[PDB]
Amino acid sequence: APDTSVSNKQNFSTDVIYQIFTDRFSDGNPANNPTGAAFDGTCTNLRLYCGGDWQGIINKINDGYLTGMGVTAIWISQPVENIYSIINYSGVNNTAYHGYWARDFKKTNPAYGTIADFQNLIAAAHAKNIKVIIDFAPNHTSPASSDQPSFAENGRLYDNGTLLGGYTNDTQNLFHHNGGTDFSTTENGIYKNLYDLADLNHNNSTVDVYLKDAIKMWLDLGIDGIRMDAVKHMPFGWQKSFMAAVNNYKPVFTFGEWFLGVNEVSPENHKFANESGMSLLDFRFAQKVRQVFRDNTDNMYGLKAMLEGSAADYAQVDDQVTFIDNHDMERFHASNANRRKLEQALAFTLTSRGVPAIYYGTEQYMSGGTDPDNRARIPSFSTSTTAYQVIQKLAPLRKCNPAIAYGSTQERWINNDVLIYERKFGSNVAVVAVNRNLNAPASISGLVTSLPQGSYNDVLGGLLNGNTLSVGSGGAASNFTLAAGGTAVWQYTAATATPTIGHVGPMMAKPGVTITIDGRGFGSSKGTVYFGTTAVSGADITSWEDTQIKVKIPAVAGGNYNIKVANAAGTASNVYDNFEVLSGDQVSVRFVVNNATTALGQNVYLTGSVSELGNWDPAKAIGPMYNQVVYQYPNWYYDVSVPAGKTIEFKFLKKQGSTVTWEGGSNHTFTAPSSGTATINVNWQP
Ligand SMILES: OC[C@H]1O[C@H](O[C@H]2[C@H](O)[C@@H](O)[C@@H](O)O[C@@H]2CO)[C@H](O)[C@@H](O)[C@@H]1O
Ligand SMILES: OC[C@H]1O[C@H](O[C@H]2[C@H](O)[C@@H](O)[C@@H](O)O[C@@H]2CO)[C@H](O)[C@@H](O)[C@@H]1O
Ligand SMILES: OC[C@H]1O[C@H](O[C@H]2[C@H](O)[C@@H](O)[C@@H](O)O[C@@H]2CO)[C@H](O)[C@@H](O)[C@@H]1O
Ligand SMILES: [Ca+2]
Ligand SMILES: [Ca+2]
DSSP, rough: OOOTTTTTOOOOOOOOOOOOOOOHHHHOGGOOOOOOOGBTTTOOSTTTTTOHHHHHHHHHHTTTTTHHHHEEEEEEOOOOOOOOOOOTTTEEOOOOOTTTTTTEEEEEOOTTHHHHHHHHHHHHHHHTOOEEEEEEEEEEEEOTTTTTTSSSSTTTTETTTTEEESSSSSSSSOOOOOOOOOOOOOOHHHHHSSSSEEETTTTTTHHHHHHHHHHHHHHHHTOEEEESSSSSSSOHHHHHHHHHHHHHHHOOOOEOOOOOOOOOOHHHHHHHHHHSEEBBBBBBHHHHHHHHHHHHHSSSHHHHHHHHHHHHHHHHHHGEEEOOOOOTTTTSSSSOOOHHHHHHHOOOOOOOOEEEEEEETTTTTOOOSSGGGOOOOOOOSSOOSSHHHHHHHHHHHHHHHHHHOOOOOEEEOOOOOOOEEEEEETTTTEEEEEESSSOEEEOOOOBBBBBSSSEOTTTTTTTSSSOOEEEGGGGBBEEEEEEEEEEEEEOOOOOOOEEEEEEOOOOOOOOOOEEEEEOOOOOSSSSEEEEEEEOOGGGGEEESSSOOOOEESSSSEEEEEEEEETTTTOOBOOEEEEEEEEEESSEEEEEEEEEOOOOOOOEEEESSGGGGGTTTTGOBBBBBBBBBSSSSSSSSSEEEETTTTEEEEEEEEEEEEEEEEEEOOOOEEEEESSSSSSEEEEEEOO
């Protein structure tokens, strides 16, 4: 199947995701609606259930609403069984309408539907070429109070109906009992509860195994991706061992939520997207887009800088999920604002690098503040708004113009208010012009592009006041005026003759798993795939077409590899880097080192004999280790994904900048569990 097929669960770059709060979309089955105090059919009270469900979604897929818009993926609320209690929070009643308060990860939330409703949803969507993504929130269960076990459901956790345990009398230690976070440090927001949510202890084997099993069921149900909640609040090593369980079983595209504030740029965020096995919601992009197009607190120069920086900070920039708003921000559209701002931010997002996501109702110009105000019910299913038409014209280009799905981004003209950028991939080009100045036109002279000589009509047809472009030889465009609030998209598509890889997925897996290599120019005859210097050809290449190749990872040593392909004639493609071959299946193990005293600005790291521990390379050592919460300095700890059942030799080190101090003595040693978790406690050797 081609790269753009609904069947590609490994690549969402050619899709347009539509984000839905199931409860607030469409109630197609009134019979599963909660009753009494939990329910408000008028949806005036935004904290109760309004009744939207899977049937409703199914209906909107079949009556042409989503498909007419060009949407090709839907992202829905966590589908698992939620607590049934109404929670009064100081006078205000709250329900689990959001799906974020899990009680059993093996069953469905009956307000959304039954397992059968779930399967029908997957079927309908699939039939209309729409992929299905689900929220998955394994960080916690529900609101709990340790000494008031009668509060809510005491954070109770069931395994398909069977009680595993609760927050009060947690002898099994299913949960963390370290207090609540102040979001002060990263370590602090990981090992303590968020608010009053009962925090799962992933270092407990039962929880570990339970969650890895629960996700397999959903995979088995046909899901196409997973959106992980609170990824900055769970151990990084555990999360990696979870991605491995997914990828070594049934790989799907996974992206998590790691919130970034205005002007916030975090190296821990980049390292996580670069190394964990999953990608992230692009908050850096969204916050910037809002400053520029909404709040006017930055200009084009700041947008451009975000585009260049990000392309450099993220190893796979094309996998970061972009948006202009979501359930955690006030709606982009402010009641009294010019609609053009939203139209422009949308056009920008759709033609930009990454995987775009549209929060439901955006195309209807919904306004609203923070939670729960940004979660009202979609007021209408009209296809006549300008925003709806913007999406409708632009979304499809991601499927038909690879420059949009996979190209580089390049600024070709800029000032405070105007940005002209070009996307390029193979013999494919897209040039987009944006003038945020809603009051003044701009004189554009000196624009140089890669488009071939000719005239080009605005892809939006003048919808946002775009114009035609005339490019002469050299790619130089002739002078033109870019209207106030103007937005124009111009493009050129052609066959790519040489193999060009545009995307690889999953990005991490053990030998033997099949990965998907997407791009153009691969030809229709099997060629060769190189993992590093190792050549793979023949039968292990399970499928080969011009835009997509499926091949099993060879049994090479764990480590990081570059991928390159060569057509049947031997022409090789560009190198796609950062592909991680696992040493085997993974388990999450906690390493604890006692009495490793350090100087300021000096931290302890861990290294060892397997690629998962960096193979003795201090530049690739794991850390810095933690030393506040679970163990206190001069004791350090850390949860690490390691190959299961392997005997591993390791050592700790102290780094300062790139200056390294090794532990003395001989290597510590240990044998990883075959499943479940473990804790290895040792003392630092001088
Ligand atoms: O002409 C090549 C040139 O085009 C763009 O420069 C623009 C500039 O962004 C505008 O602010 C204005 O000064 O006109 C210039 C073109 O004459 C590109 O930004 C630039 O990199 C490139 O050299
Ligand atoms: O919170 C981690 C913190 O630990 C390390 O600093 C040690 C310091 O080296 C000791 O001399 C001592 O005073 O305790 C500190 C930990 O509280 C790193 O130096 C530091 O960068 C790191 O954040
Ligand atoms: O280079 C691989 C090598 O790294 C580690 O050796 C350390 C050693 O433990 C230190 O005491 C120190 O002198 O630096 C060496 C780095 O070369 C591993 O301990 C060793 O097994 C491994 O082969
Ligand atoms: Ca319903
Ligand atoms: Ca946590």
